[PDB]
């Protein structure tokens, strides 16, 4: 049933748990991350929904991939699966949306099979939900030494609305 999980391959961010807002966002308590390295991938080949942040730097046409050191969902022979990508940010990488027939499937899990989403296209926001759960609801707010601000406040809920939407609306 419902089991999705976060899987990464680099460090976090500047953010305090945001794990736990997501998790808050989620609703239920779908909450899988690979925190426990110490594990193995078949957790989360256990499940067919994953999350991603940015995707690996491997290039190559044919001979260039030799070996790696690691294991990502995107080694797990993921099959029709829901992976959803941090989004955006700041940066391009053109490529063929999806929908195209060249070429052979074998190269990614997210052409392997399944569904990646990363973009937001809003259109319809008037659901309103409440996921009640144990957990408590406490507003603030911290003034960052940093100058650079971040995103909206309801970009979580925004995010997580995109993961929820294309995973299962």
């Given at each position: 049933a419902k089991k999705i999980g976060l899987f990464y391959g680099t460090q976090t961010g500047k953010t305090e748990s945001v794990a736990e807002i997501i998790r808050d966002e989620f609703g239920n308590d779908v909450v899988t991350l690979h925190?426990?390295?110490?594990?193995?991938v078949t957790d989360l080949n256990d499940y067919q929904y994953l999350i991603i942040g940015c995707p690996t730097w491997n290039i190559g046409e044919?001979?260039?991939?030799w070996e790696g050191l690691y294991s990502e969902l995107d080694d797990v022979?993921?099959?029709?699966k829901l992976v959803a990508y941090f989004g955006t940010g700041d940066q391009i990488g053109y490529a063929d949306n999806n929908q195209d027939a060249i070429g052979?499937?074998?190269?990614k899990i997210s052409q392997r099979g399944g569904k990646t989403v990363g973009y937001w296209s809003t259109d319809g926001y008037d659901f309103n939900d409440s996921k009640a759960l144990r957990n408590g609801k406490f507003v603030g707010l911290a003034l960052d030494e940093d100058n650079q601000s971040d995103l909206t406040d309801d970009r979580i809920k925004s995010w997580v609305a995109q993961l929820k939407s294309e995973f299962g609306l």
């Open positions: 925190d426990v390295s110490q594990a193995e044919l001979q260039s991939d022979d993921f099959n029709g052979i499937l074998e190269e």
